[PDB]
Design a protein around this ligand. Structure first.
Ligand code: MG
Ligand code: MG
Ligand code: MG
Length: 105
RNA sequence: GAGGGCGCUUACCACUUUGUGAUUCAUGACUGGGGUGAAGUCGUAACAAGGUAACCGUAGGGGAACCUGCGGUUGGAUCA
């Protein structure tokens, strides 16, 4: 509770109970998520509020309220897990492989 | 003179010093796991004969669930 400014920022990573949200200038600021969010992926622009600092300058987390629309999505299903998106909102993928241990086709 | 006091010395002994032990708390780089986590990734182990029957004990293997070897049990299906 006692949230801050609703703004647009880029989510750095996903950690289940919380997420890392980069602001509009390059500030690593970890936040938790809203209960009604169906999914949150790496690199998804969101609407979020950075809580409120309890100590002056020292805050713990904020919240991520809403999720914008998807440009792309990477949905891959799995046995006994269902269809799960991995990453989203991307224009180019680079398939990276190595000759070790194997190079399959 | 007898005797006493003072003073000195000795025995006992508190505090105090060194050497070196046992025990206890606080601090403590680092490090060993374990628990609590609905949505995170990795796999599909077990529960049906759960798709190589499972499990216990022991040795080895490898991100991991686990696997194989030896022996035991039915807390196993199908049974003749
Ligand atoms: Mg299995
Ligand atoms: Mg089995
Ligand atoms: Mg056996």
């Amino acid at each position: 509770n006692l949230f801050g400014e609703p703004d647009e920022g880029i989510v750095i990573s996903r950690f289940g109970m919380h997420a890392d949200v980069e602001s509009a200038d390059g500030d690593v600021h970890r936040c938790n998520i809203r209960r009604t969010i169906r999914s949150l992926v790496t690199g998804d622009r969101v609407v979020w509020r950075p809580g409120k600092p309890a100590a002056e300058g020292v805050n713990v987390k904020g919240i991520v309220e809403a999720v914008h629309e998807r440009t792309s999505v990477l949905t891959r299903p799995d046995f006994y897990d269902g269809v799960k998106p991995i990453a989203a909102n991307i224009d180019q993928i680079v398939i990276v492989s190595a000759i070790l241990p194997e190079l399959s086709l």
